[PDB]
Design a protein around this nucleic acid. Structure first.
Lengths: 78, 192, 176
RNA sequence: UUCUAAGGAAGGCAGCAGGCGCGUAAAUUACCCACUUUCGAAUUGAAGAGGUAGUGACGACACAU
RNA sequence: AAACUGCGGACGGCUCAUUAUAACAGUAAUAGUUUCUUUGGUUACAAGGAUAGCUUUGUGAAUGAUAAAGAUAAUACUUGAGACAAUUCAUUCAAGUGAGUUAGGAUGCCACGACAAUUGUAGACAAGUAACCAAUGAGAAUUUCUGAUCUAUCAAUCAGUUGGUAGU
RNA sequence: UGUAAGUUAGCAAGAAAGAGUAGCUCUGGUGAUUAUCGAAUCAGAACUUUAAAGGUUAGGGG
């Protein structure tokens, strides 16, 4: 409703339809996909409940988190 | 020829990048093929490691999947109505991934007649639900539960349904698509 | 003399440069030549070279024109050399049916020096080893049919011998 | 840069030897696949890779008068 | 012997011109790619043409120059029974792993499609072949973190430049 | 797009120098009223030819 601000249609990498209460696939909606990343990191509530679309988000896409892990302070947010 | 290396670019600091080597085959790029609409014309490209890529220069037909009815039917492509990247691609009828196209829903309508006993191309389609080999009445009640989006019906009656190409014709040499549905059809129809 | 009809089929320039059939000019031209049309013989695999050739149109500069034949053209004849070797070729030139033997008609040539009636090595006859070639090589799909293939389902039965047994939430299935 | 019958043609020693030039300044136009090993249709054939020899007061060690 | 076919000449050998975060070293990733060779596996009692060495006619001063015709083979080029495999797309059920709508299964569809129409009479057993998995492979290629000499009589630099979406 | 020496730092400067421009068929940006209505202006893309400011008007430069 508010995330379709581009020229193309925005969909998740894994967009699947949820079953109806009668037990069969309902093609009128899409399951909001969210996964859990690895070494002791919790998935934020916005990644579960939010309606944003991102193909590079580590919680809602197929991008994995590999060995290197660093820490720092935000410099710019432009 | 075309190269895909990053040695010809600039650094993130803006500083120019100097040269230590010449061009190499690992970073070789190839001239794009703009798959137009017309008589079938494909070429075989020997890629790296000897593998073969099917370069579709021109195509007319394609296999399109109706997600709701779980069928896939070959179909002739009529027109390209909306390309989300370049408006030039609309005029030239260039077939690329994510290109909204129009196809004739003849096999889908024919399949619907045989499988169900009713015709989508009928302007009285919803009226024909109320008014009734003979066991097709058991299937008849599926529609009094599940419904189609209106814009799909208009395409069926007008002979041009909207589908989205979901393959890479310049790589696989074929057009594989799917018929647009509820939330996607409304979004792409308002664009047109 | 009386004269027959001849078709020009070759020729060379005054300088020995041949003439290409496709080239439709009179003077000499340089083309990126490979071995497909002939006028260049490659050394390496897939190696082309820019060579000079002559056009297909005959002119005064031509020194030799191939348009000296099988034993003295004028009125003459003599032939032979190198009869067939494939067995299926033997049948066709001697009005031989499929069933009758061919070795009573295979071409033989004599040897005369300081003896021997040599013959080619027949290929694709119905001769003993060649008849049984199946049973020697082409049969004995044992490598894929009797030893393999059934081993899939022979060893697939393991999905119940101890696979489902282990799937019953037990610790470890014994071999027996 | 080279051959040429004057019409045309091939070649790329920062490979092993060797020549010119340059500079204060740097060696044989040798022999063999027997060592190490690579390639090949393969136990065998090639290898200026490799080995042996030639020049060698760049250097290092022992040792005459 | 020569010739067709197969393999190799992408290894080795030489040099240090270019190159100032470029390359290189240690480290880490490839759930972002991947051959060749070698090694484990998995899936008609036999067909069709023409080509060299061969023979014959030759040109040019000449190259590792070349033209015509006549035949002849295949583990060269093709067709064809012998019965799946892997590709794209759409939908769906989901167990190892730190972590995957993941290896995998099912449905529908398109393209592709076999295990030489092969070789040793001798050294039944070899040998050969096409695809598809795994290893070789801590390999190759990209990429992560840290690390380079002098110079401020070099203080501002950058416009595919920095990011996003869709594609190629 | 690019632009020097000199300088009273204001200029030189339209410096110098280079490229584009036609026809046709299209695409997009800039608003008002609450879907309808309206303005000449700018940018871009295929195709065609006799390759485009030059009929007229219209700086030679250092």
């Amino acid at each position: 409703m508010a995330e379709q601000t581009e020229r193309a249609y925005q969909k998740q990498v894994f967009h699947h339809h949820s079953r109806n209460e009668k037990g069969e696939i309902d093609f009128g909606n899409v399951k909001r996909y969210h996964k859990q990343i690895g070494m002791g990191f919790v998935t934020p509530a916005e990644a579960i409940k939010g309606t944003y679309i991102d193909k590079k988000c580590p919680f809602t896409s197929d991008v994995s988190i590999r060995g290197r892990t660093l820490s720092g302070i935000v410099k710019s947010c432009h | 020829g075309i190269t895909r290396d990053s040695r010809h670019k600039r650094r993130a600091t803006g500083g120019k990048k100097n040269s230590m080597q010449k061009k190499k085959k690992n970073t070789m790029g190839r001239q794009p093929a703009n798959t137009r609409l017309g008589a079938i014309r494909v070429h075989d490209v020997r890629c790296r490691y000897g593998i073969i890529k099917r370069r579709a220069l021109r195509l007319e037909n394609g296999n399109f999947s109706w997600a709701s009815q779980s069928i896939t039917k070959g179909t002739k492509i009529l027109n390209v109505v909306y390309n989300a990247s370049d408006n030039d691609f609309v005029r030239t009828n260039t077939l690329v991934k994510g290109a909204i196209i129009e196809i004739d829903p003849a096999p889908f309508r024919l399949w619907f007649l045989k499988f169900y006993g009713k015709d989508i191309a009928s302007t009285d389609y919803y009226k024909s639900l109320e008014s009734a080999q003979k066991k097709y009445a058991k299937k008849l009640e599926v529609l009094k539960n599940m419904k189609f989006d209106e814009a799909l019906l208009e395409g069926f009656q007008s002979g041009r349904v909207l589908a989205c190409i979901s393959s890479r014709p310049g790589q696989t040499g074929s057009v594989e698509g799917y018929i647009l549905e509820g939330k996607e059809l409304d979004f792409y129809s308002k664009k047109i | 003399f009386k004269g027959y009809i001849l078709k020009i089929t070759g020729g060379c320039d005054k300088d020995g440069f041949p003439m290409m059939t496709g080239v439709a000019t009179n003077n000499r031209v340089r083309l990126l030549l490979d071995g497909r049309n002939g006028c260049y013989k490659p050394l390496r695999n897939g190696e082309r070279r820019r060579k000079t050739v002559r056009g297909a149109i005959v002119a005064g500069d031509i020194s030799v024109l191939n348009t000296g034949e099988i034993e003295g053209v004028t009125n003459d004849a003599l032939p032979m050399r190198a009869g067939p070797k494939r067995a299926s070729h033997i049948r066709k030139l001697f009005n031989l049916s499929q069933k009758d033997d061919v070795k009573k008609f295979v071409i033989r040539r004599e040897v005369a020096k300081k003896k021997r009636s040599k013959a080619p090595k027949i290929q694709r006859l119905v001769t003993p080893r060649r008849l049984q070639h199946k049973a020697q090589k082409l049969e004995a799909k044992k490598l894929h049919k009797i030893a393999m293939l059934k081993e899939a389902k022979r060893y697939a039965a393991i999905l119940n011998r101890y696979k489902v047994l282990k799937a019953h939430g037990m610790k470890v299935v014994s071999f027996a």
